[model samples]
Target: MVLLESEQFLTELTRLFQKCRSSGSVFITLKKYDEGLEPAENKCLLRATDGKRKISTVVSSKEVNKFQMAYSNLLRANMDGLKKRAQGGEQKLFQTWEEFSRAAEKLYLADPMKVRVVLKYRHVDGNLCIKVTDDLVCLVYRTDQAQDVKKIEKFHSQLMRLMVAKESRNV
Candidate 1:
């Protein structure tokens, strides 16, 4: 898949993977099945439940870490890739967000396929708080949900630093 930085894309991909693996089952090789009657590409069938969870809570926690790392790296950078010009009201919110997203995509492509890494951002909250999807979506989501006081404190400190830097023209 082409490299892309998109909250929607990640969210959808994660959801799709979860759906496929949510029900753990064993693969069965049937000897009496007629090939002609069966459609092509249907090679596996569930024989019985595996009784194991496909995703662990740790995965969600890791995802939140990945998201935060990405955000922090972006904030630390000297250049501003995401540009948001505040405009009138509700409509401007969408417009600015789109512009910011487009800019973010360009920077995101700098490390193509880096999307597969653990240190990447998929979702952000400004005007909208959202979630992202991924192959390791289950794990990543768990990380975010397991965030504690430390994470929240870190967020505040980082946000304050960034805002102050911007206000002082240090960025």
Candidate 2:
């Protein structure tokens, strides 16, 4: 639903890798734009896969290596969020918050009362973990930063009003 610039993709991918390390795995994919009708590009679309196959960001084939090298060592990102899970790396890898948002959103939509969404903000360690689970299993998001936690909280209320509130609005 969105196109990420390579710079943003770096931070995004770092967050993505964190979610993957926690919830399961990341299935990264690449798409090619052949000479025809590509709008002046080539075989250089980077993406990830989840359910219907998540379409990702873009970089000209030339700059792919440039970005990769710029921060090859800056991976200092993902591993911050992985606390722990049930059986260990078994859930589907949600590559982006958007992916997790869509999953958690749909989980509730399937049957509002059947699945519950949980949000936790740990001030002691500065982390925010959001989860949605049904009889099947849990889909979660975890982060450790003031800014990231704030953004998650912003969406936290958004989901509460958008979906959860509707279930009890009449009461």
Candidate 3:
């Protein structure tokens, strides 16, 4: 659990994928990155795991524009062996709200409509995603940081409300 910088993050991240690609697993995640409790700041933090070791870092707000620039394209091209049929579930890293949405959308699209989003909390892990969609179970990463609670919960409630609204057009 090392807090790295953006450039170094991608480097270590890719290394993480390569090391685990053969017989292990890889994961990615983004959370609020604010190191100083004394004041104002909201940036994206990156986390990656290669089935064994895990590495993490952060990207400043303005930089993530360029950061996720290559980031998305990086994943875009690397989606080679990524398209597996009905995997149990794999966590994905993200940069921003829309960044996550796009990734989740494409991920679900690959599901052939069998996608099932689930939420879970470690209560001590100090991590979480709003609504991680998976083929079967979208295990939510509820961090020990209680601040994350309201995020996923609101998204869950808001999403559920929007989803259940209007009943898909009355017959």
Candidate 4:
């Protein structure tokens, strides 16, 4: 479900849209959502689109941009580590560990609340393999798709409800 802009944001947006729709200026405003009565708080969102650049109206692009940057850093840090781990070269093991450490530090150094990095190790063929990933990676994939995040969130929520309904019927 799409959240509507707050009256204040809406009014301001309407005024700005009329004036700046032809001109080139970013518009922003606050929005409100029910959030299923879970003590939801109304929040502000920035909308920056000039018929070409698509941005969210309910969330700040700055955060998303930061996530993208942090994600790129993590990937750069982990690439060598993952490559060596998969190859299982003795000389590269130390390098792998170092790269992995750098990856961990880069991610943890960033704001933990905004970016999360997860490391997993699994034994394969009696050798340890490191899997470095982040929640932001999922966001990357999701955002790359044509559909909006709000729609994806709602789709997943409905999928969960369907699973719940199916599970309830078996009991």
Candidate 5:
């Protein structure tokens, strides 16, 4: 199951990761094949909440699996002979979203497989953290600090609103 907007999704994910990095926090919860749903259509809800408000996006098994695989491949730098060299040599492994997107694309094209890790992002104590179990790893982007308190707050607000749209229809 190839997402046509894989590159675009990766770009947005990169931006979000960078935002968390700038704030110097990394903690979000993730779960796959979550129970509490009917057995007919098994589902996993990628959810994050800050105690007061909660936001979530329901994802199919295929999506979560593929995303996990693609992400892990990127961190391992497993180019699979697609791209021989990184742009800036060995010092900077993945410095830009463009490069990361390409790598993920390549990995998916080569051998698409199921992945165990599913990520759910949340903001905690003015810091970003991801929660997940074994076999799933979210390689968050890290960068120099930049103050964007307002931006972060606004983003979360929008995210919550969007989640509500999805939840209302299904939940």
Candidate 6:
């Protein structure tokens, strides 16, 4: 079901893709279905950069019945998660990303500790401070300068998405 086929929609979509590219936010790719498919479906790949890390997701045109709603949900989900952690309510510290991942993994186990993964991000005194904890262990990654704040934030946001996706897969 093609929800948007108008020239105006094309202009807007093109403008969006261009804007994202110009801002160094993301790169978009569209691929047509292969010849042997049962029901032809176009695939749209959205690849976004988070500093040193690159995150990408693929969504099919056929699967996305309502483009507007699907796009809105993606924006909303990312904003909600990032906003919550950046709000300064809960904060902790972790030594490294691997250490953090390990701590997060333990949270899923049926152990008595039942650790909760907490993350807090803040820009303080010319540094980007990232706090990851499980109540018992706190690790902080502090940037060397304030210039790295934006990059750190972008990477942190992407990292959170990866973490959540992994958790969902485990469940």
Alpha-carbon shift of residue 26 in model 2 (angstroms): 30
Candidate 2 versus the native: TM-score? 0.40
For model 6, state the Cα shift of residue 28 in Å: 29
What shift in Å separates residue 107 of candidate 2 from its native position after superposition?
0.9
- Count of residue pairs whose backbone atoms collide, per candidate: 12, 0, 7, 0, 10, 5
What is the C-alpha lDDT profile of model 2 across 34-131, one tens digit per residue? 34553343434555432332435666545645665543443323324433331111143274677777777777667654555454433334355666
Residue range 1-171, candidate 1, lDDT tens digits: 222233433333344323333332221111111145622221111011123322111112224445445434432331111233322102110224344333333433343222221212112211111111122221121123212213323432232232222122232
lDDT of 1 at 155: 36
- What does the lDDT read for residue 67 in candidate 4? 33
Clashes of 5: 10
Q: Give the per-residue lDDT digits (tens) of candidate 4, residues 1-171.
A: 224343333344344334433344432211221136433233223332323443343423223334334423332322221113123112221234444435533543353233322212111211122222234432111122112222323322222222222112332
Local error of candidate 6 at residue 147 (angstroms): 3.6
Worst 10 residues of 4 by lDDT: 118-127
| Comparison by lDDT, 1 against 4, better one | 4
> Which runs of model 1 end up more than 4 angstroms from their true locations?
1-95, 116-171
Q: Each prediction's Cα lDDT score?
A: 0.25, 0.50, 0.47, 0.29, 0.32, 0.36
User: Which residue pairs does candidate 6 place in steric collision?
Assistant: 92-131, 93-138, 93-139, 94-139, 94-140
Per-prediction TM-score to the true structure, in the order listed: 0.18, 0.40, 0.47, 0.21, 0.30, 0.28
Worst 10 residues of 6 by lDDT: 80-89
lDDT of 5: 0.32
Ranking of models by TM-score: 3, 2, 5, 6, 4, 1
> Candidate 1 local accuracy as lDDT?
0.25
